[PDB]
Amino acid sequence: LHKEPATLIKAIDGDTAKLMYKGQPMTFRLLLVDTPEFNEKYGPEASAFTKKMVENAKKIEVEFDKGQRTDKYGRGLAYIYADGKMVNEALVRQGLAKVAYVYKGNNTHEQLLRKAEAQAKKEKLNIWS
């Protein structure tokens, strides 16, 4: 896989954000994770985590997997990096997202994220508390 440039347009919630990519606005959904919705437990905490991460970054990048690049809603499906740190992984490592929606052919970072989840679950962080 390879990282490509994008810029933040607006934070949305724990696992979506509006980015400019190839000069067009798109809503991206984070591959291989699920955050709570804003109205659910840990929802606001996930939204705040992702917001801080993407807003404070000097450089946002998107990394598509080998499969579908957009979902049925027209959302971009990617791994999002903030100054080189993967947001997807960070959320899971903090117990603010579960590994989820692991579809065949877009699952390159699955075992990275499952290792993060195991460590969050050992620490009883957040969703795992």
Ligand SMILES: Cc1cn([C@H]2C[C@H](OP(=O)(O)O)[C@@H](COP(=O)(O)O)O2)c(=O)[nH]c1=O
């Ligand atoms: C993360 C992801 C979600 N989706 C679809 C599956 C779910 O369909 P349904 O809307 O029918 O439940 C939805 C979950 O996204 P949200 O967690 O943002 O709701 O997005 C994909 O198709 N591919 C993906 O990689």
Ligand SMILES: [Ca+2]
């Ligand atoms: Ca969600």
